[PDB]
Amino acid sequence: GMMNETLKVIAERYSCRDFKNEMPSDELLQAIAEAAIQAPSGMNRQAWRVIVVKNKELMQEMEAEGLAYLAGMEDQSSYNRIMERGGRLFYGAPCMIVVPIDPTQYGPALVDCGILCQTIALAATSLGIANIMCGYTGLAFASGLRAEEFSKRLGFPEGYAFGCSVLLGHANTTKPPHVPDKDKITYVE
Amino acid sequence: MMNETLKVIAERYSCRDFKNEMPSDELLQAIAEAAIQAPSGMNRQAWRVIVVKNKELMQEMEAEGLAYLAGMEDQSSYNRIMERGGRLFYGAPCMIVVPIDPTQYGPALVDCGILCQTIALAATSLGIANIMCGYTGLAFASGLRAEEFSKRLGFPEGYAFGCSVLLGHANTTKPPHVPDKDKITYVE
Ligand SMILES: Cc1cc2nc3c(=O)[nH]c(=O)nc-3n(C[C@H](O)[C@H](O)[C@H](O)COP(=O)(O)O)c2cc1C
């Protein structure tokens, strides 16, 4: 099929689950967050924010809270699959972009959210920065007991809830991207 | 900092005035291939990529969509589309409709957005103008012709309209939204 650098970036983008501790430069983090805000959104409502998190302590706390919520359910199956895969929710990533969203914008805010997270992932991949979408960061808020705390520490706008996150760093170990399923494309001529 | 992918992301805009010539199969296939390379929660891929080239199907969906707005007690949105030229699809000769599995609610909507943006960036990098079009869903809103359009489009059973991206070459161009740098913050 036809190829160009953007299409190569789309093709090569993969979910990294093993990061080195090396922090990406501010130069690169800025390019990535500038790319995110260029994401389109329904009615241009931009019912999101781009929070570039580099604080290790806050990251570890949200991770440990996330794991504990999972480890607290009656059905521990999910927490057990995670402990067998390495026991990390952020795979040693030294930073992440958290995308909170306005929940009173319902479904349209989630679509917009995904549009922006993909823009981040593609921008990071073009810059040689490994990444992964991580919905599990959301577990830090799930009990509701530490939700306001993490919200203020992250600087969420009032009323905003977690939407998604993208972890960023340099890959320690690689993975191929998912195989494209060509059977999901049809044509209505 | 700048590279081709970052320039595509910055220059992509929502075209609202398309030429009538059909992009080559070769370009359509490249956009469609990019789409299926979108990541999704748990690799669930609760979506499909349907490349719609049938003019009569688009014209009917467009008509049905407009009629829906026209029938609302609040004539506001109907009037907007009319001030924009009265074309719900701005003369696009083709579009990619993305149906989703609604029983996977929010996460499928997030995956829908990921995929539509993959389409928009792939299209833009190829010279193909595009626009996300949630109003394609207006063809289904009364529910009276949702089954019919779903069948005509080839939706998998149980699937519902997620989003769509209109494709074509631009008859006229318009600048993208001005990025609001204030939405970026850092937590050192
Ligand atoms: C919105 C979203 C959330 C995701 N959440 C997680 C997550 O919490 N943890 C994880 O390991 N992978 C997560 N994934 C990564 C997917 O598993 C991955 O994208 C999918 O398996 C396809 O593989 P690929 O990205 O390497 O092509 C998420 C992906 C998306 C799009």
Ligand SMILES: Cc1cc2nc3c(=O)[nH]c(=O)nc-3n(C[C@H](O)[C@H](O)[C@H](O)COP(=O)(O)O)c2cc1C
């Ligand atoms: C998910 C989504 C759905 C959209 N739906 C429509 C639509 O139905 N009709 C339309 O004219 N524009 C639609 N828009 C276009 C937005 O107005 C546009 O993205 C926004 O104004 C930002 O402008 P830009 O794309 O030119 O930067 C949609 C955008 C997104 C992201």
